[PDB]
């Protein structure tokens, strides 16, 4: 199985590409690199790169100021970027709801049913992000064909996919109580019990809709980012297993910040060669553990990578696997420039 993401980068079928990874892994650079490599290989298509990481460093990475509103990448025609905060977004929707005792009871009603089930917020939040993307398209006039999602490194953004069945059991729980109301009560209350049922069914609907998409391996895949160090690797196995338990396609693993000290012309660093020894021990381990994955081994370029010019230079190695012998010059130019 090819040690690069070339199939993904040439894929016509995908609309959703999630990129996630915990704790210091070059998740964002890897997000960018992917977005770009697809934008190049498919100029006949429009790509949205969106990010919910509160670090909000799409702007630093590209060297260009992005925000809630899509904005074309300077130097490209088919790559746009937004940074959004889903909690903030949802906050704003709920504060609007408020302004528009009756409400207290219904608010109470909802909470009782809902404030207790895990993932409701996460889903509401994701919904609002979908809707916000749509408003960007309808304003611009174009649409996006693929979004590449740079996911927040902490939390369970996609656990709301188990929600639909839960929402079902409790639609009934609630249905078997509202039945026991009589005429007098069903008169003062009925209308708002009808609303409580409404919202709940809508949420289930929406989520089920999302599910059908997310669960189509042709339509949506997840790329894990990690480094070669027990804790990240372990966190990364965890991530896969979770994702699998959501019937979501997880097929690629980018491994970042490899030192490849052996193939080095500095050789100056015993500390670096020491680190490299560990990195390679685990690297062997990955090899015999995810045998049916595209496991892509990326080089450490010291300091940071910024500018579409640099990002692109670096991004090529998701497509054609970096050979430290031959390809060294590229990394050591990038490094020396920073």
């Amino acid at each position: 199985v090819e040690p690069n993401l070339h199939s993904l980068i040439t894929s016509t079928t995908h609309k959703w590409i999630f990129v996630g990874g915990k704790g210091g892994v070059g998740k964002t650079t890897s997000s960018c690199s992917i977005a770009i490599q697809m934008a190049l290989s498919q100029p006949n298509k429009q790509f949205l790169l969106i990010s919910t990481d509160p670090a909000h460093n799409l702007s630093d990475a590209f060297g260009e100021k992005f925000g809630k509103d899509a904005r074309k990448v300077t130097g490209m025609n088919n790559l746009s970027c937004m940074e959004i905060d889903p909690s903030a977004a949802l906050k704003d929707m709920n504060d609007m709801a408020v302004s528009r005792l009756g409400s207290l009871l219904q608010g109470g009603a909802l909470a009782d049913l809902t404030g207790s089930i895990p993932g409701i917020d996460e889903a509401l939040s994701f919904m609002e992000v979908m809707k916000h993307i749509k408003r960007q398209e309808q304003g611009e006039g174009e649409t996006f064909d693929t979004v590449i999602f740079d996911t927040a490194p902490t939390g369970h953004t996609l656990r709301f996919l188990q929600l639909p069945n839960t929402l079902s059991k409790l639609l009934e729980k609630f249905g078997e109580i509202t039945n026991k109301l009589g005429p007098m009560l069903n008169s003062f209350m009925g209308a708002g019990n009808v609303d409580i049922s409404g919202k709940l069914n809508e949420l289930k609907a929406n989520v089920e809709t999302i599910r059908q998409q997310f669960t189509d391996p042709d339509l949506t895949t997840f790329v894990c980012v990690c480094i070669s160090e027990f804790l990240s690797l372990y966190e990364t196995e965890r991530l896969i297993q979770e994702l699998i338990s959501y019937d979501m396609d997880v097929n690629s693993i980018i491994v970042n910040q490899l030192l490849f000290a052996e193939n080095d012309q500095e050789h100056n660093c015993k500390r670096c060669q020491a680190r490299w020894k560990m990195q390679k021990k685990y690297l062997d381990q990955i090899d015999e553990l995810y045998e049916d994955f595209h496991v892509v081994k990326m080089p450490l370029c010291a300091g940071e990578i910024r500018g579409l010019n640099n990002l692109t230079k670096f991004s090529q190695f998701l497509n054609k696997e970096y050979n430290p012998i031959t390809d060294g010059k590229v990394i050591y130019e990038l490094e020396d420039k920073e």
């Binding site: 509160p54 670090a55 889903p86 404030g115 902490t154």
Partner: protein
């Protein structure tokens, strides 16, 4: 409303507001603040869970 419910609401709300605030902070760029908040949420969660049980038992039939 009894002081017990008044407080349950208050906490439940404090907790919510804290959660959304923490979701806007970068765990890596603000490890300390982020962690502190996580602690206060876990704490609020235990207080909330008590007040709930206390309210539920006190309204049972």
């Amino acid at each position: 409303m009894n002081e017990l419910s008044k407080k349950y609401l208050a906490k439940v709300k404090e907790r919510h507001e804290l959660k959304e605030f923490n979701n806007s902070i970068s765990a890596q760029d603000n490890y300390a603040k982020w962690t502190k908040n996580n602690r206060k949420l876990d704490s609020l969660d235990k207080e909330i869970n008590n007040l709930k049980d206390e309210i539920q038992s006190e309204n049972h039939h």
